[PDB]
Amino acid sequence: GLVPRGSAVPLCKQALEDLEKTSGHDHPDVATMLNILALVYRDQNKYKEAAHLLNDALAIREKTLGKDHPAVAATLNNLAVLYGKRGKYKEAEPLCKRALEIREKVLGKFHPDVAKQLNNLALLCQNQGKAEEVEYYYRRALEIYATRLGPDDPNVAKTKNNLASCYLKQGKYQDAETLYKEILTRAHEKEFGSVNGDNKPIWMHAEEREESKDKRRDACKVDSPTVNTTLRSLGALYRRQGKLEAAHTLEDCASRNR
Amino acid sequence: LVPGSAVPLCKQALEDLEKTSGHDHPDVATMLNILALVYRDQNKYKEAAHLLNDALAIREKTLGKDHPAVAATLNNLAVLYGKRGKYKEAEPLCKRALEIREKVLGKFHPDVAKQLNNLALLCQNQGKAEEVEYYYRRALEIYATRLGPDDPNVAKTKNNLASCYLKQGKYQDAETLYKEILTRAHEKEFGSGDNKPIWMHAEEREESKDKRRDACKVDSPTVNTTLRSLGALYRRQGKLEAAHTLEDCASRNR
Amino acid sequence: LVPGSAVPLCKQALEDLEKTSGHDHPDVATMLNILALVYRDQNKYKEAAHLLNDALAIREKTLGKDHPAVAATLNNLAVLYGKRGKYKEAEPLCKRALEIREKVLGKFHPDVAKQLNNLALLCQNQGKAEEVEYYYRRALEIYATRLGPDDPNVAKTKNNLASCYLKQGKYQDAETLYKEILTRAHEKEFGSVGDNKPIWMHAEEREESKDKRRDACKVDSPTVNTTLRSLGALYRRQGKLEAAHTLEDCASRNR
Amino acid sequence: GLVPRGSAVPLCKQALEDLEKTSGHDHPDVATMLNILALVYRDQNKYKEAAHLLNDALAIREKTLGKDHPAVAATLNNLAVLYGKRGKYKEAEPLCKRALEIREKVLGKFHPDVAKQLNNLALLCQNQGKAEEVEYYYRRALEIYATRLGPDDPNVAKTKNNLASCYLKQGKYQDAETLYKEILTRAHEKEFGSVNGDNKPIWMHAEEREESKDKRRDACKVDSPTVNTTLRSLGALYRRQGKLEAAHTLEDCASRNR
C-alpha cells in the first residue's frame, strides 16, 4: 500500500469530478482518471471497487476510441486480472478472450505480447478446471515463444512445464513425459552438442539404471530453477510408474543444484 | 494496471490542490503520493521515489517528525530505494520508520515485525550478516509470540535466519533451526521418545549404517524447503544417507 | 539563452551526484538549482520553483535554517512565485529571507534594502497598501543613508512610495515627496537655497500670478522627468493647470 | 542571480568532463552542456567567460549538425547578445548577420522570427552609429510586422518609432514626421473608422492651432505607452520647427493619458 488509506480516494474523486465538468463523461481523460482511481483502490486491496470503476473506464474507451483500440485491450486485461483476484474466473474469461482478439488484430498473431495474453487465458481456464482449453492456449503460447524467441529462451521451458502439468491433470502421462525429456535433452544439447553414444541426457541414465535395478546413487552441471523443476517433475512421473531408482537419479541431481 | 496522459492529468490535479491549499498541506503530499503510485506502475522508480520524498517533506512539516503517516512514507520510500539497489540509502529511512512504529504501536505490535523483516532484508543486500541476524531474531520474537508458535511466519523467518547463518558458516545454528521447525510440525500432529522426528530417524539411519533407502506425514510448502535445507547440511557433513531420508520425504509430499 | 535535450542531460548530472553523495548534500541542492535555472530559461516557472523548493529543503537540513545560501534560495523561490502571480505564498518566503539577511549582514546593509524592495513590490500586488508603505520607507532609510542622499535609488524609491500614497489618496504626502526630489536636484546643481527656487515653487507662483504665459531648465535625469510629470498630475487634480504646464514643459525641454 | 555564486561552475565542469569521456568532445550533448555552463556564467554576469564557452559550443554544432542548423542560429544569436552586453558591437554583427541568413533559409524571409533577428541587427548597428544600416533593417522588420501580423499590431508602431528615431539622427525630419503621423492617423481611425472632415487626427488640430495666432491651451481617448511616445516625439519635432502651440497640443494630450 504505497498510498495511505485516508484522503487518496476523495482527492482523486475531486480531480475526476473536475475533469467531468470540463469535457463531459465520455472523454479519454475521464477514463484515465477513473483508471488512476482504480489503481488507488487496488493499492488498498479493494478489487471489487477498482473493477467497478475500470468497467466505467472501459465503456468510455469503447465509445471514444473504438472497440478495437489498444487501450481497450489494456483495460480488458486489467479487468480480467481484477476478477481473477476475486476468484471470478468465469466472468473474467470473455474479457481476456476479447483482449486477445484485439491484440491479434493490432500486433499480429505471432507477436510476443500475444503470447503473454494466451498465457493469461490458459491460467484463467485452469482455475476453472477446463483442461481441454488450458492445453490449447499453452500450445499457442509455446508456438510463439519457441519461434519468435530462441528455442532456449527461458519462457520455452516454463511454458512446457505448465503444459506438461496440464497433461498430468488429464492423465496424458506420455505427453507430459515427452515434454520433460525435451527440456532436459535441450539443456544437455546446449552445454554439449551431439551424443557420442555415452553423451546421454540424465533421463536416459535414469531409466537405464532402473533396467539393471542399480541400488546405488553414489550429468549434474545443468543449472536452472526451471530445469530443477523439470528434474523433480519427471522424477514424480517415474515414481508413479514404480521406477524409484530412475526418480532417484533425477531427484538427487536436482538436490545437487539447490 | 494503467494504460501517456496519466502523469500529465495527475500534474493538473496536483496544481489545482496546490492552488487551493498551498504547497505545505497533507492533501498535496497525498497527491504527490498518488502521482508516485502512477510512476511506479510505469516502472519509473527514480521519479516515484523523488515524489515520495517530496510527500515526506510536507508531512514532516505539517504532521510532525513522529507521525504514523510519516512512518508509512519513510517505509515506502525505502521500498523504492531498495528496488533501485540503493540499500545503503534506504537503511536510515527504514530505521527511522521503525522508531516511530515502536513508539506509536508498541515494541511488539505485529506491524513492527514486518518492518523488522524489511530491515533484515535491507542489511542482507549490503552483506551486514550480523545486523540481519539481530533483526530477524527481533522479528521471530514477535511472530512466535504475538501470533501462534506454529504460525506460517515463524517457520519462514527461521529459514531466512538459517540462511543468514549459512553465509556465516554457522552450520550448527542453522541445523538447530531446521530441526526446531520439523520437530514442531511433527509435534503439531502427534507428538511429542515414543515418537521421533524425521531428522532423528535420518541420523539413526546413518548410525545403523543403513544403505537401504526408498514420520513421513508432514504437509507444508515451507516444511519441504526445511527438509531439503537440512539434507543439504547433511551432504556437507558427509551424512549422505541421512540426506536421502529428508529429501525422499520431501519428494513424497511434492 | 539556450537551444530541448538540456533538462534530460541535467537530470543525468543530478542522478550522478545523488549516486555519489546521497540526496541530502549541498551539491545536489546546487544541481537542482542549476536545473531550476535551465527550466527558467525555457519559461517553465512552475517546474523551476518546484526544483528550487527541493534545493531549499536540502540546504535547510544540511546548512541550517539561518544559512545565507538558504536566504538566497528563499528569495529566488519568491521571485519565481511572483512571476506566476502567487504573491500571497511568496510573501512568507520573502519575510524569512529578510530575517536571515538582517541577522547575518545587519539591519542596514545595502542588500537588505533590495530585499525590502521585493517585499514592497510583493505586498503591492496583493493591495496591502499599509505594508508597502512600511517596506519602502525601510528601504529608503537604508538608501538615503548608506549610499549618498542623492543616489539614483533614493529618487526611485521615493517615486515608488509616492505612487503607493497616490493609491491611498494621500495626495499631500505624495506631493511632499516629489518636491523633495526636485529640491534636492535643484540643490545639487545650483546650491544651498532663495533666490535659488525649485521649479515647483516657480510653477505655483506662476499660478499665483494668474499667468497663462508659457515657454530651472538645468535639471537633467530620467527619474527627475518622471517626478516632474507626476507632480504635474497632482496639480492637474488640484486644478492648478498653469503650475502643471510649467513642470511638464520643463520635462519636455529635457527629453 | 538565480544560482548561488559557489560550486555551480565546478559541478557543471564535472558533468561536462563526464560527457566528454562518454561521447567525445565533438558531440551535441557536450555543446548543450557547454551551453548550460554558459547560462550559469551569465547568471553571474560573467559575459566574457560565457561567450568563450558558447564559441566552443558553436564549433561543435557547426561540425556535427551542419553550418545551417537552427541550433547554430540560436548559438550565434546568443553569442552576439553576449558581445553586445560587453559593448563589442562590431564583432557581434557578423555573427548576428549569419543567424539571419540561416533563419531566412530555414523559415522563409517573412517569418515573424526573422523580424526579431532584423530588429537585433538594427540595434547592433545603432550602437555603432551606422544609421544607413539601421534604416535598412528596421524597414525590413516593419515590412514583416505590418504584413504577417495585423497593421495595428503593437510591434508596428514600436518599429515605426525606432525607425523615425533613426531618421532624426540622419537629419531626415520629413520622413520621421511622416511616420509619427501614420501611427496617430492609424490609431485615430481605429477609434473612429471614417474621416468626415470634422473628424481630424490630433496632429492636424495641432498644426491648425499653430496657424491661427491661437492662445490656446487646454481626441485624447487613444491610450497606449507607444502612442504617448509618438505624441511626445512628434511634439519634439514641432518644437524644433518653432511650432510651440502644435507641440503643446500633443504634449498636453500625452499628459492627459499618463
UniProtKB/Swiss-Prot annotation, chains A, D:
GO terms for cellular component: cytoplasm; cytosol; kinesin complex; kinesin I complex; lysosomal membrane; membrane; microtubule; mitochondrion. It is found in: Cytoplasm, Cytoskeleton; Lysosome membrane. Transmembrane segments: none annotated. GO terms for molecular function: cadherin binding; kinesin binding. Keywords: Coiled coil, Cytoplasm, Cytoskeleton, Hereditary spastic paraplegia, Lysosome, Membrane, Microtubule, Motor protein, Neurodegeneration, Neuropathy, Phosphoprotein, Repeat, TPR repeat. GO terms for biological process: lysosome localization; microtubule-based movement. TPR repeats lie at residues 31-64, 73-106, 115-148, 157-190, 228-258. The modification Phosphoserine is found at S224. Oligomeric complex composed of two heavy chains and two light chains. Interacts (via TPR repeats) with PLEKHM2. Belongs to the kinesin light chain family. Kinesin is a microtubule-associated force-producing protein that plays a role in organelle transport. The light chain functions in coupling of cargo to the heavy chain or in the modulation of its ATPase activity. Through binding with PLEKHM2 and ARL8B, recruits kinesin-1 to lysosomes and hence direct lysosomes movement toward microtubule plus ends. It is linked to Spastic paraplegia, optic atrophy, and neuropathy: A form of spastic paraplegia, a neurodegenerative disorder characterized by a slow, gradual, progressive weakness and spasticity of the lower limbs. Rate of progression and the severity of symptoms are quite variable. Initial symptoms may include difficulty with balance, weakness and stiffness in the legs, muscle spasms, and dragging the toes when walking. In some forms of the disorder, bladder symptoms (such as incontinence) may appear, or the weakness and stiffness may spread to other parts of the body. This is Kinesin light chain 2. It comes from Homo sapiens. The gene is KLC2. The chain holds residues 217 to 479 of 622 of the full protein.
